[PDB]
């Protein structure tokens, strides 16, 4: 049963009687004295089978021979029992009936089929209005509705020739009478004479509805029921409860109105009631099929006897209770347990613990096989019996079958793939599954009682995947990036951190040791401390030869701690790793090489010997925690009073008159956090550096070993923070308003805390705990959107076959660089080829897997940006190539074939958001060069004045710092015309100073050095009578519109710049003369009179938050537009003025020759930070604030906005101090911009105005191009995750997720043959996900199809 | 034309309220059917 | 800037509106208005607070 | 880690975000005004001495603080 697609469409009635075993006929169930079900109700044996297995109702014919032969007396087909699962009965509806779904979906199916607003239909369907069907040619329209006295006259109008109904009966006359192919031609006429944009464009979109309805393989009438099937009786069962008492489904009550209102009005008819009557048993009729259906959409349920509304057909399948989110995915799991974790030191990291119990109930079947293999019970029974006894040998053939056998421990929010890991076993006495520490970690599982669950993997594929895929040992890479996993927490790293350092005079100070052997034995045996500062031999093995490993002993000059550390390290690391503090980063970071440089198994291997190691000597250093630890600073009560002071400072001021109450309460609020940061560095300056001892000599003082202080020097728990509230001050409580309230809390905990000041904690505590509850309770929205967008997306090509990549650089904000080179061209494969400076070289070929060696040369030559290959621009037909996304796993190759990496990469950027702060969250004029450097701009538009200076002439000239190396440094972004100091391209002395210009104002200078006059500059028309009137400084300032006459619109602001004698020098290069003309507020100060400098102010022009949160991210990719939307330029040219304030002035921008004539209408009340005589270049900043990504997108291009979407998810990120790398970003990117749209079909089938997908467009023209013909031109669009999932080409997958109604109703009528291949499809369907292993079983399927 | 205010201000704002609906709505119905009806069309 | 809002003017079209604004396409009434208003918060019957 | 420990990292963030909101919302540093900014009126120079850059006199300070209690 290895079908094929699976296909949905209408109803046909035909079809619902082929469906049948038997018309349903009366409302009865059962039999309310034997309990066998009446016939024929709901229930039956002859419609839907006989009750037990192969035996009769009155039981003729009670024997498995007998199978297949009806009973005379009952008709029963004596069959299974479970053949009552799958029979259809049907029902006769007397009259038809409206399906609801094709009535109420939201757009009418009906409406937008037959031409015709909602409301009339309505008064078809409930008998308001009459409508004629089909009326002939005397006088009235097809559709033309009526009412009752109008149809009461057209009677004795036209009592012939006259055809008008109303009911359902209207409907399905209108429908059937309907013929199709008229109306598409109809409608293509229409299409060809009404030249109307509008008009056309929805007579066009309901011809692509005919023809859609055409090319299925429906009929239109089918959508008005007659025959309406019953569920079966196993569906919706009526199961006895024990006292009598039944427990029916809902069904049954529904279909038993259905049932008595259909015979209801069959009675009806044979009377021949008046029509009042059978009108209102019509509509009783159709009220209770619409709730049999989805009992919503009508206007009111109809509750049962609770007041709960009874749940329906079209309820079964929807919600987070139907079959497809309840029932498809989320299934209960046979094999299976769970317990309370534990914490089980003892073990190596590849084997979990486990319960002698758990192991004797997941694997009865294992043992029972096992049992009669061995002989020790000849039949099952016996071994069941033996096994239940707990006998002697069972336990030693349960740990022959747990030999290799991986369980599957989960904890219960499995957020990234790490989540989920297998683990050998090891049967443990107990109940606790001791689980191994340094996974917890990953699993973000303290021990305080949480519940991890053990499954079994039956099979033997699934054993090997167990293995091999999911095995402890072989993911320790984070698959969000490539550091290692297995980070040692908290004993472990503070057992290091008291081993690996130094006091200053310990026993066996100095003397030298032959080796960490004698390190160790020297410690033991006790005659020198674990740490106390000592020359030994160390051999430390380099392997900087291809594979080799240079032995070479020396004398490092180290402790006993640090050498006795050295026993555990592997060979190919180099002894200045462990020489150190060995904090935590710094532990971490000694695993992060050991990978980098020896592979896996080493680093596996040797994360176990630290840990081991680690618990060791934690045990050993006692590192306890006493109240004598947290050291008060003597000099605490002294800045209290100081502090306290000057608050009686602010409070006289303030009863003096001279600060308003907000001002002292903020200068309150400053000097109490003064007071705080002064407190909590004194106390860690008592803290730190405290321990004074003394070797041989005076004193001298060193880092200290108060317990706390190394509990929050190692990393191991807690910071300076939770050290300041333990001893020094505790801040300033923040009520939950968000306003920081102004009484500090001068107390600390070893202190006590009087009344006021613990209630006044109260406040932030309890904020913090009421969004930590909200936050466990809503943790994983963002990785369930991200995974429906960019799911069915698998690695399914070798190599695309590209040259196109993303150029990489590293990030610079305007100062020291954030993020270097090595971290985002770590993985990622080159696109062209990489050339040293001179080119000199062919230095990497465009194919080569950036693993650290290319990082290594790369960072040898100084390579300044490397043009990576990147995941969306990969030309693969559903799918990602081979190389293209590069390498990241929690392995360290290339990506393999098909391993789903859409998933993962929605994981990759879920579990850290669980790192992140829920709410929302916002952080808040000269250039200084930092160091030593060469400068360089680019787009730099410099004129050489007669003054000397630098100045810029063009708006996007940026300041960066290069070095005699070449790399980038710095960058700056310069302002319009800041004042330039030093060269272009040349050499500039560290720290200093290059660039000033004006902070809020906007200077105009010139161009070249020419006199100067005036043109259209009439004071009360044009300009102003403005001054520094003590300085007599005539400023003629541009008039605005509001002040410039309705002429004075008409009139043009203007600069006119004269040469020697009264005409006008053309602009160096251009034509138009010398002379700027200026806008609205273009204030001027000098007049007529005077020859400019380059560089003259002829005007004076005036004039970031970041949120963090994860709604941040959350709003990135949903690509909502902001708020004040960057404007931005749509033409390369000429930059001009419009139609001058109609609300909105209009811009008009000029390119040299071509289709110029673009003008755009901007809200007047924002600046516009353009020139009035420029060129602003396509994508260039004409206004300012955030720019849309869909005018990214459009402007400049693909790499343009999803550089921009990964820069800006990186900052939500790293602003938080959380590393994931950028394929994961960028392949949700892939997933956004998917869709596309069409400018020029041309030699291609799509509609012009269409939009449509990329991959499908892109194969379309691909061919035909390919061919002599000519392509189309598509213009890229750019959905949010939440509409780029939305449209799918499977319907069994969009009725997951999307609502389900719509979902169904639309394939419905569409009659779309939905294949399978996705993941959702499979994984409901329940066959082979085509993700991982399962690829190569899809691609066997693939090659069974097609010959 | 109002109750189509209340349509570009649900657009907009982002949200409504049975307040602002029941501003908007068109009045002398009120039947509270016709009212769960419109409110079930808005949603 | 209320009473530049407020379109009624005296006793009876103030009470007119409320009368209308209650029950929808009730006709306006002197009588009706009057025992409208003074049950919506001022009798015994529909309004008490404890 | 703990349903406690979370809980107190959102509140360092909240109270850290409001003490940095109310120390960004003190001047202490700038050119002197030597006069109101709305105004005209002078700044005493004992209120100049007190906030270095005080851009208000303490009437229109208290007037604008007064009218952005309504949020507006
Ligand atoms: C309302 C209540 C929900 C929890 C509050 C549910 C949960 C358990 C239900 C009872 C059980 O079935 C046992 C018993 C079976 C008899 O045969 C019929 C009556 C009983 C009393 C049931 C009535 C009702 O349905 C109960 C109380
Ligand atoms: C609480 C949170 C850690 C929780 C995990 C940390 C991580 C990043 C921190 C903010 C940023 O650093 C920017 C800024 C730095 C200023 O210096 C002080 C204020 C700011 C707003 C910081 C507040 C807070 O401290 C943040 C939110
Ligand atoms: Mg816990
Ligand atoms: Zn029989
Ligand atoms: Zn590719
Ligand atoms: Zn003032």
Redesign the interface.
Known sequence: EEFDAIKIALASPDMIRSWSFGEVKKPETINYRTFKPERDGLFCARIFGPVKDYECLCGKYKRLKHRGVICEKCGVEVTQTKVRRERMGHIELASPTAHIWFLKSLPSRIGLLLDMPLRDIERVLYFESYVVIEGGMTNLERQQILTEEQYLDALEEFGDEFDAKMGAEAIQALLKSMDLEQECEQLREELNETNSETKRKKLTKRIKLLEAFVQSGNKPEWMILTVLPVLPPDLRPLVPLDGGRFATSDLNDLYRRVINRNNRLKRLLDLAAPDIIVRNEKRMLQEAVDALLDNGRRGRAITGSNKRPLKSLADMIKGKQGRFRQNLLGKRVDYSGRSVITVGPYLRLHQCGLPKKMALELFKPFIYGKLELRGLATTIKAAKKMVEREEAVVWDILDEVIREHPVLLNRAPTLHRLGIQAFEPVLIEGKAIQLHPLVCAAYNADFDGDQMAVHVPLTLEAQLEARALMMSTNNILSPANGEPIIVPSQDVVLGLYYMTRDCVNAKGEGMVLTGPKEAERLYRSGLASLHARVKVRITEYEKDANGELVAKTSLKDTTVGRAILWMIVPKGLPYSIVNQALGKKAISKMLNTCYRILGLKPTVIFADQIMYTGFAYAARSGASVGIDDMVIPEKKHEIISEAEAEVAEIQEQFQSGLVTAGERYNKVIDIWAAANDRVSKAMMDNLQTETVINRDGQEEKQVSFNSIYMMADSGARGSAAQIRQLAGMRGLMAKPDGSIIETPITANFREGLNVLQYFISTHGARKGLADTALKTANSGYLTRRLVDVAQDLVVTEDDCGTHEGIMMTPVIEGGDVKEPLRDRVLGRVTAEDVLKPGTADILVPRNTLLHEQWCDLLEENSVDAVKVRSVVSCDTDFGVCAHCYGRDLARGHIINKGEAIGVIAAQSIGEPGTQLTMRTFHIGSSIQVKNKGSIKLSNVKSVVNSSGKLVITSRNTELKLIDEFGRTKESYKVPYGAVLAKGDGEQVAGGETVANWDPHTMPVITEVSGFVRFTDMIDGQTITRQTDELTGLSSLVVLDSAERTAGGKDLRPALKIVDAQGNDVLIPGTDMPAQYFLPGKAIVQLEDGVQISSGDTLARIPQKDITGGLPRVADLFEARRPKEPAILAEISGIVSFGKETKGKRRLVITPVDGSDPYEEMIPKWRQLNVFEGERVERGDVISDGPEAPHDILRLRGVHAVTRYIVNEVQDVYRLQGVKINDKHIEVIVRQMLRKATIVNAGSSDFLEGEQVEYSRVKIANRELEANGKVGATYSRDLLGITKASLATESFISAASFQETTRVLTEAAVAGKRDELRGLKENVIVGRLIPAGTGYAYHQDRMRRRAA | SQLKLLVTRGKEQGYLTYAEVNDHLP????DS?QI??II?MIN | ETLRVDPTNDRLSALVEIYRMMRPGEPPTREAAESLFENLFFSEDRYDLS | SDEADEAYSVTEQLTMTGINRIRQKINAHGIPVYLCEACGNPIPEARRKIFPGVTLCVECQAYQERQRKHYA
């Not at chain 2, 009045?27 to 009120?30: A, N, T």
């Open positions: 009045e002398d119905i009120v059917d769960e009806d079930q």
